Design a protein around this ligand. Structure first.
Ligand SMILES: *[PH](O)(O)OCC(C)(C)[C@H](O)C(=O)NCCC(=O)NCCSC(=O)c1cccnc1
Length: 89
């Protein structure tokens, strides 16, 4: 989307950064990577407030949000909206 490539690249960088994140089928449900739901979610929540200065907003949890990468892209777009770039080079 406007910056969905950064989300996949940013999220994947924590797990497999030595591999091109754009070379990963972003059409795969990241549920398998649910690992970020807890370990990464805590690091991302604290990091998000550390860099962007946004409240963790962990009052409500939505496990269904990790069902697909696109679902997460909408959450970031609604909260923040970075520059728009072409996902495919
Ligand atoms: P664990 O066993 O993974 O804990 C499971 C649950 C589902 C409770 C998980 O910890 C949780 O709280 N997830 C709820 C949904 C959630 O908070 N997901 C965050 C969306 S990503 C968003 O916060 C964000 C931050 C930084 C960059 N992009 C998006």
């Amino acid at each position: 989307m406007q910056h969905a490539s950064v989300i996949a690249q940013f999220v994947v960088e924590e797990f497999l950064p030595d591999v091109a994140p754009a070379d990963v089928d972003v059409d795969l449900d990241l549920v398998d990577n649910g690992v970020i739901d807890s370990l990464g979610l805590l690091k991302v929540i604290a990091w998000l407030e550390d860099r962007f200065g946004i409240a963790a907003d962990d009052v409500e949890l939505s496990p269904e949000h990790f069902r697909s990468i696109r679902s997460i892209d909408a959450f970031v777009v609604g909260a923040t909206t970075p520059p728009v770039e072409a996902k495919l080079q």
